[PDB]
C-alpha cells in the first residue's frame, strides 16, 4: 500500500560459476536504470504520424560503497587472487647526515640502486653498495650537509594483476530496503529487487585525492535470462505477514 | 489575462482500453516538450528556392512525484500484479556465537546451503537439517566467538517481474493547475492542458539513495488522434461562474 | 571603451505579414549562440587538404520570461486563439461520508460518470444518478466510511489547440540593455541588437513543479536578409542624443 | 626549484596583417588545451594496435575577460565598425495620460506607426502626426486613463554587421604570469606563453540577464607555423636577468 | 582483511633507458582508469544474448600536481630545453611625465616601442616609434589625459617548444598509500600499484583563473608487457611482517 | 479580555495508535514559539520585486519537567518497553530500555491547561485552551547531571496541518468560570 | 542640546485598508534594531581592486505592550473573530459525552469509557479564532512617540515608519496571570514618494 | 517514576581502570533534518532520519597525567608527537536516583580539549570524547535503571 | 604564572615577569565521515592539530606588543603634538617581517612546559576606556621545531 | 538616505600615564561603517 522509501538499499552479490557467494557487506548508493530504444513508423498523406515502435530493452547496474579492498576490486576482473609473493617496492628516505669524512652511512635494505638528492635540488646517482658508505662528491655536497635517499626494497604480501585478455562471469544481484507508513511512519514493508543473470563491466574509476575516500564504484550490466523470459524482479515484503 | 502562476499539478490516467481512469494522484513535478524537424531542400546554383515544408512535430511528457507506488511500477510494464506468491528472498543473519562444543543454532529457518562469515572472513558451506543446530570446525573459528550467518528463507509477497515484452494501451493524461492575479493575488484561472493520445515509453531512473526520496520518473510520449488530428489541448477560465 | 552591462534586455516582436507589434514586455533573461561548421576536400599523398571549402553559418536564439501569456504560448505556432467555447475537463470530490443507507450525496454536475476511491484503494464504478445520490455495496464500505470521487465537469473558456500541421509567417526581433561606466558609476551607453528576417522555430520546454516560476523559452532561427544579406546588427549608442 | 602561479595572465593580441599590437587589457582567465587524434589500426586475434598514423596535433585557446567591448569581437567575424550611423531603434513611452477629449500628447520624435495599449491589452497603430496629439477611441478606453507608447526613432551610433565570409586574418597570442617561490615568499620567475599562427574561430555565445559574470567569450584556434612547425611555446624568464 | 583509504598516494617515475628516477614527490589527485565497449543488442523477440564481444582492454593514467615544474611538461612533451635562449616579450608602463608638453620619453628599454592608447575609447597609435631615448612623440596632441605605454622587452631564460616530435619514451610507474583498520584507528596495510611498460600521451590541459593553483595535468597510457602481457598490478602489505 | 497570563502548564499526549494519555500532571515549563518563513521572487529590469510568494508557517514545541520520568525518554524513541530483564550492571533484574538507530515511529498530540485571573480583580476568568493537531517527535534532549544541581529533561516537537481539517493550531479562548 | 531619554515609547497603528487607526499604546519598552547587507565584486591579476555594486538597508521593530489581548494575535495574519462560535474543549476533574471522557485507573495505566482524574467538556462558547495556512499581509504604519527630559524636558520626538510590512514571529506562554507582556515583529519597505524608512523628529516645549 | 538526585555520578572504563569519584558529568545529542517539500505548500510532513550524534563531556575532581593523556630532566614520560587518540575501551555511567546506569558501546576515543594558567580557579576543564555504533548490535548508548 | 622568553637569532633574556592567565588551547579542524545505512557515522578524522597560545600581563612596556607587529622602537624622534613638537621614543605599526622565532617557558609552581620554535601573530585585542586600565593581551602560535618534530611537551620537575 | 556618502574623517582618543608621557593617540583616514545604534531604555540614561 502506498509509502515510499528514504534509506539506502543492501547489496548481496552470488557467484553463478559453481556456488559462491560475494560482499554480504554494507554499500552507501546503489542505483539501476530501465532504458530502452527510440524509432517512429510514418506514412500516409501528409506523412501523419500513425504508429509508435520500439523494442530492445536494456538494463544497466550502479553501485557506491564507502569502503575499499581488493577482493571486491577483483569483481570486475574474476580471477583468483595468490597471497604471500615476494615483489618489489620502493623506499623514501631522510634525515641522512654526512660526516666530515666526506661520506654517509645508509639506513635499510637496497636491492637495486641507491640515488641521492641535494638541498638545493640538484640530483645524484651513485652505485649500491652492501656496507652502506657511500662517498659522496664534494661539489655535490659538503660535510654537514642534509642528503636524502630512495631506494627499493622487497616486501611480501597478496598481489593481484590484471590480464591482457578479459573475462567475466555471470552473477547474482540482491537489494534490501524497508517501506515505511504513510502517516503512522512505521515500517509496512521491505523491498527486494532481484537481478538474474547478469554479468559486470569494466570501467573502474579510482581518484586518489586527498581529504576523503574515494568510495569506489562498481559498474554491472543486466542480462535477459533464457529459462523463463525474465530478467528484472521486485520483490516487497510485508512485515505483518 | 496576463498572469503569474507556480504550483504542482493533479495528473489523470485513463486506459483507452477499459475505463481505468485510476491513478488521480497528487505529483511532485510535470513537465511537457515539444520540438520540430525541417526536412528543407536547398542546394547550389540550382534549387535554391527552398519551398518552406512543415514536418515532425513531437510531444513529450515528464511527471516527477515525490511518493512511491507499485501500480505506478506496473504503469509501464503492462503485466497484472500477482498477489499472494512463494517467492524466496535472501536474508542476513548477525550477531552468533559459537558454544564450546563448536555447534551453532539459527533462529530463522534456511531453506538453501548456509554461509558463516568470522572475523577473519572465509567461505563455509553446510547442509539443512531438522535438529536446528549446525556445527562448525575448529580452525575456522575458536570457541565463544562472534559470527554472521547468511541464508534465504522462503517469504510472503506480492510479485511483479519485468520480461521481454513492451508496453500496452494507450492513456489519456490531463494537467491541472492555477493561476494568480498580478495585482489583486488570488486564483484566477485553472489551467487545463489536454491531451488526445499518449503511450508509455521505458525510461527509468531512479537512486535509492539515503536520505533522500526515490522520486520516480515516467516518461511518456503523444500521438496525434484519428478523428481530430490534435497533439494537445490548453483550457483556460476564469471563476466568475 | 570598457564597459560593464547590469540589466536583463528588452524585447520588441514583430510579425512581418501585418503590423502587430506584440510582446512589449521586459522579460527575464535574453542569449544568442553562434557556431560555425565546414567541409573540405582531401586530395593524394598525405591527405592534405585541397583548401577548397564550403561554409555556412546559423544562430540560435534563447529568451527567458518570468511572466505567462496565452498568446505567448501561440506565437510559437501557426494557429488562432479560439475564443468561449464548452469543453470537458475532470474533478475530483473529498471527504464523502456514507450514510447508514449506503448512500452518498453528490455537490457536483458529472456527465459522464462518478468512480469512488476508498481508503484502501479499491474502485467502483457507477453511472451518474439524476438526484445525485448513488448506491454503493456494503463490501467496497460499511456505513459511516470516509469516501473520496472522481468525474468530468463541463467548462466554458478560450481554447488553444497547438497543431503539427501548420507553420508560416516570419519576424524580426530587437534587443535594448543598459551599459555602465566602471568609472562614473553611470550609464555611459546603452546597446540594441537586432535581428531582421528571423524564422521561428518550435523548441517549447517550460517546467511546472512546486515552487518558482515556469520561465518558458522559445528558441528561433536567423536567415540572411534578402537584400541586405544580414542576420545579426549590433549597435552602440551614447547619451550625447 | 619549483614554484605555484595563483594569478591569471596578461593577454595581448597582435594582428599578422599589418603591425597592429593592441587589446592591452586585463582579463580574468584563461586557458589552452592541448589533444591528439588516434585513428589506429586493428589487428587480428585481439592484440588489435600493431601500428598507428598520429596525426593532427591541434591546440585549442581560450579566454574571458571581465568587461565589454565592441572592440573585442571583430577578431570572430572579419569586418569593419560603422560609426554615426542613423539606424532605427525601438523605445517604450509609460505614463501616458488621456484627457476628456480622448486625447493624448507625445513628447517623442517618433518615425513610424504608434502602438497605443490600455490597462489590460489593446493594439491601436496610428499614423504619425505633426501636432503630436493623437485622438483615442471611446472602446479603446475612458478618460482619466493612463496608457503606454511604443514606436521607432532613429539613433547615431557606432554600427558593425556581421556576415559569412571574409575569415582570413590572423594574430598572435601572449600570456604573462608571475611565479611564487614556495618558501621565500616573494616572485620568482615571469611565465610568458606565446601561440603564433592562431586562427579566430567563431564560438560566439553570452547570456545578457544581470551583472552576474558577464564573461565574454573569445574562443581561438591554433595552427601550424610555416618557417618554424612549433605550435606552442612557453618561456621561463628569472627576475634575477 | 577489511579496511578504508582516505588519503592521497606518492607517486614514483622511472625510465625504460635509463636509470633516472625522477619525480619521488607528492600531489593531492593521481588517478587511472580502465576503458572498455563493444557490445551489441542482437536482439529478436527483444531478446538478450550474450552481449559481448571481448576485446580492448585499455589503461589510461591521470596524475596532478602541486608545483609547476618544467621538467614536467618537457617530459610529457619529450623535447631538449634551450638553457640561456634570448626571447621577446611585451610591457607597458603607467605615467612617467605630465602630458601638457607633447614630449615623452620611455625609460627601461627602447627596441619596439610602439602603439601607445588613448585613454577613454580610442588609439592613440604613433605607428613607428623606434628612436635612441627619445623625448619628442608628437601624433595627436592628447593633452593632460594619462599618457599610457606598450614597449617590447628582450629577455633570457628557459625555453620550452611544442611540435610533433613522435615522442617515444617508455617508462615504469609505481604508487604507495596507507590503508586504516575499520576497527583499532590505525594503518593496516600499504597498498602499491605498479604500472610497467607506461608511455606518455598528448594530452594538456590547464586553465589560469582568477585564484586557484595550478595543478598541471597530462595523462599516460599503459601497454602490456613484452614478457608477462601485464599493465596493470595490485600489491598491498601490512606492517606486521 | 485584556490581562498578562504566564505560568507552569499542564499538557497531555495523545497517541493515535493507542488510547495512551499519559502526562496528567503538572509540569516545570512548557511554551511554543512560531517563526513564518520570508521570499522573494525578484527580476525584471535591475533587480526589482514583483512578487511575495508567501510560505510555509513553522511551530516548535518546548516543554520542560521538574523531574526525570522513564516514559519521557520511552516516547522519545518510541522502543518497546520489558520488564524483569536479566541485565548486565553484577546482575540486575528490572526495566529495561535502549536506543536503536530507527526509533520515535509514532504521531502524538499536544493541548495545553491554563487558569487566569483578571489582571485588576484577580479572580478567575477563563481557561484559555491551546489544542494541536498530530505532532511528529524531534528528539534533541540535553541532560546534565553533576550533583543534586537538576534534572530538567527537555524534549522539541514538530508539527502542522492536518490531511482533512488543514488546522496547525487550536487557540480558544473560552470557560468563564463566571 | 542635551536630552535624556528614560520613559517607554506611544505608538499608533493605522490601518491602510480601511482607515482604522488603533492601539493607543501603553507600552513598556520599544526596539529598533537595524542592519544593511552590501556585496562587492572582486577584482584581477595580483592583489584584486575592488568594484562596488548594489547596497541595501534593513530596519526592524518590536513592541512590547503591558496587556494582553487577541487583537494582538489577530493583526498579526488579518482574520475576523469567530466571537460566539461553538468550541471543542476536556478539562480535568479533580458535559460528560461531548468530551469523550477518560477514565485514570491509577499508577500509569488506563482504559477508555463507554460514551454514555477524567475530562469533561466546558461550554461558553465566546470568543474564537482559528489560525489558518492562507495570509499574506495587511498595509499599516507605525509612529514612536518619546519625550526627552532636559538635563539641565528639552524636546517630544516621534519616529515614523511609513511603508511597513507584516512579518510575524510569535512565542507564547498563557497559563496564569504573572506576567506575558506580548510581542510583535514588524518589517519596513521603502516609500515610493519620499524613498523614506524612518525619520527623528526633534522638538520644543516653547511653541 | 519520581526521581531525585543527591549523589555525584561515578564513571567506569575498561581498556579492550578509572574506580574513582568524578566531578562533572553531562553529554549531549542533536540529529539534523530536512524539510520534505510537498505539495502546495508542505502538507506532508515525513520527518527525515539523520545523523544521530553523540558527544560526552566528563571531568574528574583532580588533573593527573594519564586523564590528559587519554586525549592523545626525565620524570614522568608523556608527550604528544601525532595521531595517539585510539585506545579501546568501554564507558560505564553509576547514578542512584532506582540506580540509573549509562553506558555507550564502541567508544573511540577522540578530543578537542581547554585549558588554562590562571593566578587560581581550577584546573582539568573537562575531557570531550566521540563514540560510534557497534558492528554487530548497531547500538551506541544504552540507559540502565534499577 | 611566571614567564619568559629567549630569542634564537640573538642572544637575549626578556619577558620576565609575572603574568596573569595563560593557556595553548588547540585546534583539530575535525571533519566526519559517512557510512551509509541509514547514513551512520564512521570514522572522524581529523587534518591540522594546531595549537594556539595567550597570555596576558597587567602592565605596558614599550618593548611589549612590538613582538606581534614589525617594527623597531625608534627613540629620540621629532613628532607633531596638537594641542606642538616632542623627542622621544615611539613606534610605529607596520604589516611586514613576519620571520622572528621566539622560546616560549612558563615558570608554574615545578610543570615546566617546553615549547619551541613559536611563531609570532599579530592578533590583539584590548578592552578600555578612559583614564586607564590597558592591561594588553599578547597572542602567539608554536610550530614543530622539525628537529625531533616536536611543538607542545609537557615536564614535571 | 541609503548610502549616497564617501565622506572621509578622522578620530583620535587618548589615555594617560599607567605605565611624564601619555600615550597621544594620532589616526589616519577613517572611513565611516554605518553602524550606529541607539537603544532607548526605561530608566536609563542614552549613550550613542
Known amino acids: 500500500m502506498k509509502t515510499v522509501i528514504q534509506d539506502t538499499a543492501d547489496v548481496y552479490f552470488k557467484r553463478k560459476s559453481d556456488g559462491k557467494l560475494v560482499f554480504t557487506a554494507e554499500a552507501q548508493t546503489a542505483s539501476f536504470s530501465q532504458a530502452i530504444s527510440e524509432e517512429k513508423l510514418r506514412g500516409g ?33 574474476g580471477e583468483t587472487i595468490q597471497e604471500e609473493t615476494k615483489v618489489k617496492v620502493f623506499d623514501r628516505e631522510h634525515g641522512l647526515i654526512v660526516d666530515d669524512t666526506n661520506k654517509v652511512t645508509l639506513k635499510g635494505k637496497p636491492v637495486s640502486d641507491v640515488t641521492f638528492y641535494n638541498k638545493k635540488g640538484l640530483t645524484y646517482k651513485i652505485a649500491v653498495s652492501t656496507d652502506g658508505t657511500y662517498t659522496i662528491p664534494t661539489a655535490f655536497a659538503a660535510a654537514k650537509d642534509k642528503l636524502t635517499a630512495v631506494y627499493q626494497i622487497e616486501k611480501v604480501g597478496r598481489r593481484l594483476a590484471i590480464k591482457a585478455s578479459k573475462f567475466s562471469e555471470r552473477y547474482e544481484v540482491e537489494y534490501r530496503t524497508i517501506a515505511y507508513n504513510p502517516d503512522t511512519e512505521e515500517v509496512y514493508s521491505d523491498i527486494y529487487i532481484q537481478f538474474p543473470n547478469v554479468s559486470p563491466s569494466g570501467e573502474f574509476e579510482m581518484s586518489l585525492e ?16 533464457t529459462d523463463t523470459d525474465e530478467m528484472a524482479v521486485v520483490i516487497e515484503a510485508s512485515r505483518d505477514e
Chains 1, 2, 3, 4, 5 share one sequence.
Open 45 to 77: 498523406i501528409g506523412n501523419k504520424p500513425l504508429y509508435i515502435l520500439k523494442s530492445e530493452k536494456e538494463i544497466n547496474l550502479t553501485v557506491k560503497n564507502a569502503f575499499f579492498d581488493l577482493e571486491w576490486l577483483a569483481m570486475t576482473q
Open 210 to 225: 586527498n581529504g576523503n575516500a574515494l568510495a569506489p564504484e562498481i559498474k554491472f550490466e543486466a542480462l535477459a535470462d
